[PDB]
């Protein structure tokens, strides 16, 4: 029994060339899991940017083991879009739960 991860903040605005950091938070019953970071295209296709455990897309676990930083380094304007994270438990029962989607806005310098 576990609820889907949260992906925060719902709207992150940064300027071109700076780093953008979302936080995906996930209550771990154990360490048999993978956490993926996805970007959703306007055509509703999804692409995996990065995964924990593991380029310009980084995922780091915070010490409480629940919170994960998901960072776009040197964010470009065409990084603006829709992002989410998904947690997959691997055992004893495999399941994937996706977070609600968030928006990255990367503004002109």
């Amino acid at each position, epitope marked *: 029994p576990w609820n889907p991860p949260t992906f925060s903040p719902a709207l992150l605005v940064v300027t071109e060339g700076d780093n953008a950091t979302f936080t995906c938070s996930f209550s771990n019953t*154990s*360490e*048999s899991f*993978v956490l993926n970071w996805y970007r959703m295209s306007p055509s509703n296709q999804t692409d995996k940017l990065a995964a924990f*455990p*593991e380029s310009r897309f980084r995922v780091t676990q915070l010490p409480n083991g629940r919170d994960f930083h998901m960072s776009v380094v040197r964010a470009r304007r065409n990084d603006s879009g829709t992002y989410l994270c998904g947690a*997959i438990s*691997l*055992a*004893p*029962k*495999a399941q994937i739960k996706e977070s609600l989607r968030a928006e990255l806005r990367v503004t002109e310098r």
Partner: antibody, heavy 117, light 108 residues
């Protein structure tokens, strides 16, 4: 880049004990769950045991529960299978396989354990 | 335990054929379903994961389809190096379980 090298397969008497090892390289060992899979001669594949990246979670097939123990040492990139109270039907090739995900993406070539009097 | 079955247990085909192998799970496993190849004397290797995703390095003539209980592995323009045994495997629930395997040999 990925290499898994199993060692330890020998002839062992039923009821005896035996430890297999697997040396891993080409990936960050401690970031990945690990698994053992075995194949008796001429038969199919049977999942044996699995262990999480940090070592705190383990899983076993019912046919080896209470008998087999899986462990790992991240300091030397090594995976172990402790096989206790062996039975003849444990005779098989034992494969070391990488398990960080919903698949098994890399398999070593295996080591042959023979249990017989 | 989830029981995996495969159909047919063996089949004969020619170079250039398109063939399909069938895998059935005794309970719904969504898309937690992998396909492996094995040749005699060596370890298996991953072909398809998540029932339709191609493992990096596998030729694109391999593909998989299905969700729930019924799954299919298709090999198009079958090549001489594809004559082997093929196994499905559910990754949905421990104990992970493999199908009995399907042998593909060369039709002379």
């Amino acid at each position: 880049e990925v290499q898994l090298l199993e060692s330890g397969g020998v002839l062992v008497q039923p009821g005896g004990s035996l430890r297999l090892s697997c040396a891993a390289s080409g990936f960050t060992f401690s970031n990945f769950g690990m698994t053992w899979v075995r194949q008796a001669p001429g038969k199919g594949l049977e999942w044996v045991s699995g262990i999480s990246g940090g070592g705190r979670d383990t899983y076993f097939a019912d046919s080896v529960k209470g008998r087999f123990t899986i462990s790992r040492d991240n300091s030397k990139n090594t995976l172990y299978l402790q096989m206790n109270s062996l039975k003849g039907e444990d005779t098989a090739v034992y494969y070391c396989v990488k398990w960080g995900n919903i698949y098994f993406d890399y398999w070593g070539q295996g080591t042959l354990v023979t249990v017989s009097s | 335990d989830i029981q995996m079955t495969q159909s047919p247990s063996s089949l004969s085909a020619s170079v250039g054929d398109s063939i399909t192998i069938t895998c059935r799970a005794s309970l719904s496993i969504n898309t937690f379903l992998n396909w492996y190849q094995q040749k005699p004397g060596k370890a298996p290797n991953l072909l398809i994961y998540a029932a339709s995703s191609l493992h990096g390095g596998v030729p694109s003539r391999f593909s998989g389809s299905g969700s729930g209980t019924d799954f299919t592995l298709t090999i198009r323009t079958l090549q001489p190096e594809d004559f082997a045994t093929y196994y499905c495997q559910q990754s949905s629930n421990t104990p992970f379980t493999f199908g009995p395997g399907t042998v593909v040999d060369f039709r002379r």
